Amino acid sequence: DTTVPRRLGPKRASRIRKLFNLSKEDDVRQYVVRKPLNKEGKKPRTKAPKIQRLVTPRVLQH
RNA sequence: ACCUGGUUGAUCCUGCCAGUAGCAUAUGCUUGUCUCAAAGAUUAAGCCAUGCAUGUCUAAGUACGCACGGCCGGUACAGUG
Ligand SMILES: [Mg+2]
Ligand SMILES: [Mg+2]
Ligand SMILES: [Mg+2]
DSSP: OOOOOOOOOOOBHHHHHHHHTOOSSSOGGGGOOOEEEOOTTSOOEEEOOOOBSOOOHHHHHO
């Protein structure tokens, strides 16, 4: 009758693309699953994982 | 005549005795000050309570534990862990 949510989204870029059916022209950074987090006595915040296997200028320079 | 003394009618042979200094094992009485070193052994390589004796991170493999935290709408990832 009830439901238990899945708690973690994908982290590798290709797995994000597979989950959200993205193309090559789509920006992976736009579709990162952000997690809201709010403890009593602390201001609300939102955290996202670090994308892995993401092409950046540093990799191209290497 | 290869130490000093003993075992004979004389000369000898063979068995012997006592004194003299150390090593090892065990054990006594005494022990004010100071420096250095040692520590096994029942043919038992026999039996063991308890604790300890081996762990490790740099700018540089992997952090979405608010576990703690600055800046924010630019918001993939500040940083510590
Ligand atoms: Mg990488
Ligand atoms: Mg004689
Ligand atoms: Mg290193």
